[PDB]
């Protein structure tokens, strides 16, 4: 169906096909069994032009999958800085919790993406956020030996 092809086009970077499918009436918010939408998959794989096209054509920036994961979580975790910026400009919830209680800031701190941590903090990320395992983003930075991120989070918390 058109929704399956759009999910495939979005994860595979098929800019032209994404536009063809949405012209042929594909649902921009098509969700698979797992709650994943085209915007999740484009945000995950770093397809900036597709993220922009999907947002322009009504994609839900705050869509969550079965694990509470939002496009912003995926872009923050996967190190896609320009996508993080575009998703926040479109109204992404900077402090969304997934089903582990992790925020985008937790996942950027864990995965070692320092400029993404700085942009999240600039857009109101909650430095004190605790996941369900009792960890703050600072704790995950420390745990993962991300000393630059730990230093920036300690300053933000002051």
């Amino acid at each position: 169906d058109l929704g399956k092809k759009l999910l495939e086009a979005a994860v595979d970077g098929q800019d032209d096909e994404v536009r063809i499918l949405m012209a042929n009436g594909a649902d921009v918010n098509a969700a698979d069994w797992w709650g994943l939408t085209p915007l999740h998959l484009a945000a995950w794989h770093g397809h900036l032009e597709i993220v922009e096209v999907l947002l322009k054509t009504g994609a839900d920036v705050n869509a969550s999958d079965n694990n509470g994961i939002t496009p912003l979580h995926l872009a923050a975790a996967r190190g896609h800085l320009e996508i993080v910026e575009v998703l926040l400009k479109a109204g992404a919830d900077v402090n969304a919790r997934d089903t582990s209680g992790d925020t985008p800031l937790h996942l950027a701190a864990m995965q070692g993406h320092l400029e993404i941590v700085e942009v999240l903090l600039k857009h109101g990320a909650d430095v004190n956020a605790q996941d369900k395992f009792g960890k703050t983003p600072f704790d995950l930075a420390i745990d993962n030996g991300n000393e630059d991120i730990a230093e920036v989070l300690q300053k933000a918390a002051k």
Partner: peptide, 22 residues
């Protein structure tokens, strides 16, 4: 396809699912 427990668990779960259809 190994099961990562604790912080990042939700992320790793979704990251693995996306890895299937990728």
């Amino acid at each position: 396809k190994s099961v990562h427990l604790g912080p990042g668990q939700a992320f790793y779960a979704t990251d693995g699912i996306i890895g299937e259809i990728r």
